[model samples]
Target: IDPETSKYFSEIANLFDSEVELEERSVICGNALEETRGREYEIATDYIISHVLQTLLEGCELDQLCSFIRNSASVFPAIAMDRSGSHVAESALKSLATHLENPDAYSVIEEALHSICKVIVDNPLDMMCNCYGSHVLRRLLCLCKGVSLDSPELYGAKSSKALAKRLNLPHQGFPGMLTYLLSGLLSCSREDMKYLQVDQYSSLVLQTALRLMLKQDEQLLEIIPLILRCNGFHIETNVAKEILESMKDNSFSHLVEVILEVAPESLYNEMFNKVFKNSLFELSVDRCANFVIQALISHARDQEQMGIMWEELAPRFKDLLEQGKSGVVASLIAVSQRLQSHENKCCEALVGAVCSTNESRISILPRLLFLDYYFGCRDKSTWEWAPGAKMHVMGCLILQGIFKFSSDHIQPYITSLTSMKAEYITETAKDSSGARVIEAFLASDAATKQKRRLIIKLRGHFGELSLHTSGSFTVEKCFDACNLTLREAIASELLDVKVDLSKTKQGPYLLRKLDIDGYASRPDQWKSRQEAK
Candidate 1:
C-alpha cells in the first residue's frame, strides 16, 4: 500500500481551490488511516504522511488544516488525531506560522505545553516516550515568545517557570519533554544543524539548559569549557574569547571551589593533553598564549594560587623552551617581576629554564637595546644598579644552562658579527641609527681587517683614549704600523683632532676641528671628514 501506488485520493493534489483541496485531502487522509491498520501498512502510512505534509505546505492551505486540527482537538481522541497525521499536522502548522508570521505561536505552544505537562503529571511512565515528548517540547520552545527569547513571557513562562517547577518536583516528576530539547545540544553538533547556529536559538537553548540544571551561577565555568572541547578544532577564537568574557562577572567565585571539589588535577591534565599537546605549535598559539597571559596577569593578585599554578606549570613548559618559543617571554618577565625570590624551587627553576636558553640572548638583546635608549644609560658607571645588564646576563645564562642540561644539544651556531661600512669612514651615515652604526662597524672592511691592529693598539695605549693628556700617542708604534710618510699623513689628520681647549665646554674636547677653507681647498680631506662625520 505505497501511498504513491495507492488509488486513495492521489487526485487531491489536482484540486486548486482551498475548499476543494481540503475536502480531497481529508478523504485521502481517511483512506491512508484505514490502510495503516496492519503492520505491513506502516511504510505506506509514513509515505502518505510525508506526501500530505509536503502537499499541504506547497498548496498554501495550512490555515484550513489548522482549523481542522483545532476543530477536532476534542472531537477526535488526542492519540487518534495525532496518530498517522502527526507529521502532516505538525509541519502544516509550522508552515502556516512561518507563512503568516504568526505572532500567537508562543501562546499556542504554551497551551500545548500546559496540556502535555498535565498528561505527564497524571501518568509518570509517560517519560518512556522521550523522543516524542522532546519533539513536542522543541516545537513549544521554538514558538515560545513568538520566536523571540528576549520577550518576558518567553523565558519567564515556558523556560524559567517551567524549569523551576520541574526542579521543585521529584526526579519522576521531571518534564522529559524539556530535557529532550536540552540534551540535543550535547548530542548534536552545531555544524550539522544550521538551526543551532542561530544566535537567538542557540543562546536560548543554552540559557534554558542552564536554568534547568540549576547552574546559572556556574553556567560559563561549566558550559564554555564543554563548548570549547566539542568544537575546539573548528571554533573561532573570537567566539571563544566572547564566551570567556561573558563569564567574567561571575568567574572564580564558585569556579575555584568546583575546581577544588569536583574536577581534579588529573582531569585538567587529561583535558590539556587532549586539546593542547600539539596546539602550541599552531599559528594561533601566540594569540592563545597572549590571552592566557593577560588572564593570569589580571588575576595574579591571588598570589598563593598563582604561585601554585606556576609551580605546576613550569616543568611542563620545558619542551616549549626547547623549541625556542619567545612568546612566553612576556609572561616570564611578568612572573619574574612579581615572584622575585619567593616560594618553591620550581618557580625559580621555571624562570631559569626559560631565561637560560641560548636563543634568549639573541631574542632579548634587541628588547634590552630598545629599553637602553630611553630608560637607562648603557655605560657601566650610569648603569651600575640597572636591570638592563641583568637581562643580558640572564640571556647568557639561559644559553649556557640549556647546553649544560641537554646532552643531545648541538653546539650553538654563532653568527659572526659583520660591520657594514666603507673603509676610512669617520661618521655614521645619515640613515644609520646607533644599532645600524654598531652593525656597520661590525660589518665594516676596516673593522674586519684592522681587528688585530686595533686590539693591539688599544691594549698598548688603553690609557690614551681615556683622557686629553698630551703625548699620549705611541708615535713609534704608529710609525711602525705605517711608513714615515703615511705616519705623517695620519699625524696631519690627528692635528685637526683638536682638544676643545674651551674649559667651559661639555665633557670631552672635539676629536677634530673643522677648517672650512682648508676643507674646500682639499676635497679628498673634506670627503674623508664627511665620511667620518
Candidate 2:
C-alpha cells in the first residue's frame, strides 16, 4: 500500500480503538472534526475503505481491525464518515449479520451486538436523527429481533426497544425496531421474562409503541382503547392479579406490595380504570352480586378498605336485589357468608336486607339457595323461617373469617344444650373455646332432635349421622341420651311435668321413658368436642 493509504489505515484503526475517548469531542465538533472535515474526511474514508476491501480480497487477517470498528460504533457516532468509513462500517454490519446466522458465531455476534447496544444506549438522545444513522440503527435493531432462545439475544433487543421508546420522536418511514423485539420478549416464558425483568421494561416500550402506532384518523379508532386495554392487561394482568390474590389471601391486613417499583400513579390509575371499564361488569346479577360480595369480603379482611368499597358498591347491590334477580340474591348470600366469617358490621345490614319480611325473604331466596349450596347444609333452609337465622349465619361466618375475634359470638346458640347452665352462653363465652365447641354440641343435639321429630315433622337427619358408624354404641345412641336429658330438663323447668311412673299412657309413658333413659350413659359425640371444649 502507498504511504498515504497506509497512514490513513493506521489512523482509522486508532480511531476505531479509542472512539469512546472521542465521544465527548464528537458531540462538540459535529461528528467530523476540523482536520477531517468535508473533503479531507471523505478522502481519508475512501483510503480506509480500499485498504479494508483489498485486505479482505487478499484473504489477509482483518478481524482485529473489524473488531475495533465494532467497538467504536458503540460509543461514538463519529465512526460513520464519508465513503470509505461508511463502506467499512456497512461491510462490518453485513459480516455480523452473516456471522449471526452461524450457530458457532453466536457468542461473537452477541458480544458485538452488546457493544453496539451499549454505544446506542449510553447516548441514545445524542445520536444524529438523520436518515443514514437512523437506517443503521434500524439494521442493528433488526439483528436483535432475529435472535432466538437456542441463541438468545433478548437483552440487546430489549435495550434497543427501551431506547426507541425513550427517544419517542418520530422516525417516520423507518418502522420502529422496538416492537418486533418487544413482541419476542413478551412471548418468552414468564419464567424467562422474570429472569430478564421483562415486566419492568415492557410497559414503557408498549406505551410508547402504542402511542406511535395508534395515531389520529387511525382506521381502528373504535378498537384502539380495547387494544390498549388488552395490551395493558397483557403486561399488567399477571402482576396485578397476582397482587390482588395475595392481598386477599393475606386479608388485605398486610401491606400491599408489587413487583413494579416505579409505576407512576397516572399509569396505575390508567391501567386500573382500563380494566374496570373494559373488562366484564354487571354481566350477570349473580356475577355482579358475587363481585360486590367478594369486594366486601376483601374489604372486611382488609378492614381499612371496607368503608371505601361499601360506599361504592353497596347501593349497586341494593339495586340488583330490588330488581328481583336470583343471581344477585345468590351473590349477596355469598357476600353474607364472607362478612359473617369476618364478623363484619355489614352482616347485620345484609341479613336485614335479606330477610326483613316475607316479601324480602322471597326476594332474597336465590341468595339463600346460594348460601345453602356453598355451606353444604340442608339445615340452613329449616332455619329459614327463624327471624335471625340469616343474621346468625352471617355473623358466624364473619367471626370465623377473622383470624382472632370473640368465640362467644358463636357459643350461645351452639353450646346451649351441652352447657351445665345454658344461660348467657352467647355473651359470656364470646372469646372462649366453648364458643367454638358449641357448634359441634348443637350438631349432636340436632341429630337426636331430628330422630324424635321424625314422628312429628317426619324429617330425620339421624340416619345421616348413623351412616358413619355401624356399632350399637353409635353416634345415634349418644345423641339419644343427650336428647332425653335436654328435653326433660327443659320440660321440668318450663312445663312443671312430673315423672308419672304408674301411668303407661302417652304422656305418662313419655315421662317414664325419659326416667328410664336418664340412667343411660351419655356419650360425647361431637367431632370437635376434644379441641373445642
Candidate 3:
C-alpha cells in the first residue's frame, strides 16, 4: 500500500480500537476520506479499512455515511463482495436508495451496481451461490426497474428479439438487472441447479430471482420449462430429490406451485406419471412428500383427471392404512368424496383394498373395536386420543368413511357393538372416539330392530350422556335418527334434569333439541301453570 493509504489506515485503526466516542471516530474517518476522496486509497486490500467502514456505517449519522459512500463509490463493489465488508456494502446501497431522488447520488449507485454486475458476470454461478454476493445481488435486483413497455432503457427496443438479446446480457443496465441475474442462473448446468435448490443459502437467491422475474411480468412460462428441465423433468434422480425438498420448504413451496400452475398439460401428465409410477405408496406416506402428493390431488383439473390419480393410489390404500398413515388416507378419502362422479367407485375400491387381506382386515378392524372398547376401558384417559395421536384418531376416520360411504358393509360390526353389555355402550358413549363410532352406527341405514336395540341401551343413560362433551354430540345424533316414540323416551330422561341440564356445557344443546321437537314444552307449560299460584 502507498504511504498515504497506509497512514490513513493506521489512523482509522487507532480510532476504532481507542476508547474515543463513536461520533469522534466517524468524524475522523469522514474527514480522512474527504481529503483523499478522488485518490485510490487501496481500501479493498486493507482489512482495517473494511472494518472501519463497517463500524462507521453502522454507528455514524446517515448524512455522514451517505457522504462517505459517495466519496468512496469506486470501492463499493469490492466491499459488497467481501466477506467482512458486505455489511458495510449493503448499508451503502441502502443509503444510496434513500437519496435516489438526487441525480448525483443515483448516478453513484448506478456505477456501483455496474461494478457489482461485472464481478457477477465474470463468475455468475460462484457469485450467485456466495452467501454475501447473493445478498447484494438480491438487493440490486429489487432496486431495478420492473419490465415495462415505456422503459426502453431496460427492455431495449420493446421487440421480442431485442428483449431476448437484452435478457442474456452479462450486465445490461439498471433496467435489465433482474433479467441479467435470472439469465445467469439459468445458464448453470443441471447438477448446479439441483445443488442450489437444496442449498440453504442459494435456495433463497433462486427464490428471489424467480420473484423478481414474476414481478417484472417477464416470460415466466418460458422460465418454468427451463427450471423443470434443469431438475431433469421429474425423473427419479437426485434432481427429483431436490425438487421434493423445494416442495417441502415453505420458501420454495410457492415457487413449486407457480411452476405447476403454468406448466403445459403434457408436462403435468408426464411429471405426475413419473412421480406416481412406483412411488405412490412411498410418497403417500412420507412426512413431507405427502403434502406434495395432496397438492397434486388438489390441482387435478377435472373428475376424470382426479379419478385417474385415485386409480393409481387405489392399490396403496391397504398399505397406507396398515402403516398407520391414517391422515393421508383420510385426505385421499376426502378427495375421493369431493369428486361426486367417482365417489362410489373410489370409495368402494378403498374399502375393498382394506378388506382384501387378512392382515389388512386385522390391522384396521382392531382399531375400530379398540376404539369402541377404549370408551369403556379404565385407562382410556391415559391413552393419547388427541387429533395428533395418529393411531387412535385414524380409527375414528376409518369408521366415518364406512358410515358415510359404505354403510351396508358395517352392519356386522354394529351388531357386535350393540350386543356388547349395556354398560359398555354407555361407557363408550362418554368417550370421544367411542361416541363417533356410536354416532356412525346410529346414522347408518342399520336394521330398525338393531337400531332400536342400541337406542334402548342408550336410553337408560340419557341424562348422564347428555352432559358429556363427546357424548352430547352422540345423543343429538341419536335423537335425529330415532322415531317419535324413542325420541319422546329420550326427551323424558333429559326432562327430569332440565334446569341442571340447561346450565351444563353440553346440556343446553340437548335442551334446545328437545324444545325444538316439542318434547320439553309440555313440561314447561305444566310448571308455568303451577307457578301461577
Q: Which number leads on lDDT?
A: 3
Q: What TM-score number comes out for model 2?
A: 0.26
Model 3, C-alpha of 275: deviation from truth (Å): 3.1
lDDT of 3 by residue, 234-316 (tens): 35565455465456554344345444434555556666665444555566676555645655654455576666666667777
Give the least accurate 10-residue stretch of model 3, judged by summed lDDT: 162-171
Candidate 2 minimal-lDDT segment of 10 residues: 251-260
At residue 445, candidate 3 shows an lDDT of 73
User: What is the alpha-carbon lDDT of model 1 when measured against the actual structure?
Assistant: 0.35
Off by over 4 Å in 2: 1-304, 316-344, 357-464, 468-533
Give each model's whole-structure lDDT: 0.35, 0.35, 0.57
Candidate 1 lDDT over 1-533, as tens digits, reads: 45553444355444533455455655554443333243222321354544643454434443344444444333222332234544444453365345335444444444443443344334322221232332333344444323422344333233444322211211212244444433434444444322232233333433334334443234334444453344412334554343334322222211221221232233334333343333323311343343333233222433454454454445545444444433243343344334442333433454444335544432222332223321334452233222222233223222222222212221121111112122211111111122232222223333234433432333322222212232222322233344333433443444443343222132133222323244436757755654543
**Shift in Å, residue 298, candidate 1:** 14
Q: Which candidate is the best by TM-score?
A: 3
Regions more than 4 Å wrong, model 3: 1-196, 199-268, 298-313, 340-366, 369-391, 406-428, 434-453, 516-521, 524-533
